[PDB]
């Protein structure tokens, strides 16, 4: 599913991301825009052999199981395919583990290079929240 911008925020707000570990909701919308273009079926392979999955591009070296990432962990205890659902629940729940790992949102490279320090409230403007 490809979310609309305001529709995504509603989904994120309802699942408890607004101000989760102190990141305002706009940070999470901005990170989804630049990670996946709001497309829940986004996948991207990396040079190490890992793959990033779903609306927040969660990586199979640490976070989910894809059966092809040798030696990797599965810290969210999910198959990477769950991250591709139209229902974002599994993505959000895993995201909350990742941001709580010590480096905050810097674990998302698009966030660090395209959102951090920018006017991220602009991503929720106009929305009925
Ligand atoms: Na893995």
Swiss-Prot record:
Any Gene Ontology CC annotation: cytoplasm
Molecular function via GO: beta-N-acetylglucosaminidase activity; identical protein binding; lysozyme activity
Tissue-specificity statement: In the egg white and polymorphonuclear leukocytes.
GO-annotated biological processes: cell wall macromolecule catabolic process; defense response to bacterium; defense response to Gram-negative bacterium; defense response to Gram-positive bacterium; killing of cells of another organism
Record keyword Signal present: yes
Protein name: Lysozyme C
Cystine pairs: 6-127, 30-115, 64-80, 76-94
Binding site for substrate: 101
InterPro entries cross-referenced by the UniProt entry: Glyco_hydro_22 (IPR001916), Glyco_hydro_22_CS (IPR019799), Glyco_hydro_22_lys (IPR000974), Lysozyme-like_dom_sf (IPR023346)
């Amino acid at each position: 599913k490809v979310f609309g911008r305001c529709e995504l925020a509603a989904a994120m707000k309802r699942h408890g991301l607004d101000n989760y570990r102190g990141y305002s909701l706009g940070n999470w919308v901005c990170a989804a825009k630049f990670e996946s273009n709001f497309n829940t079926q986004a996948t991207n392979r990396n040079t190490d052999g890992s793959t990033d999955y779903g609306i927040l591009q969660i990586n199979s070296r640490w976070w989910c199981n894809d059966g092809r990432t040798p030696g990797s962990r599965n810290l969210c205890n999910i198959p990477c395919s769950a991250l591709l659902s139209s229902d974002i629940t599994a993505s959000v729940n895993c995201a909350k583990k990742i941001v709580s790992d010590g480096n905050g949102m810097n674990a998302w490279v698009a966030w660090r290079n395209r959102c951090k320090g920018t006017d991220v409230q602009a991503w929720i403007r106009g929305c009925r929240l």
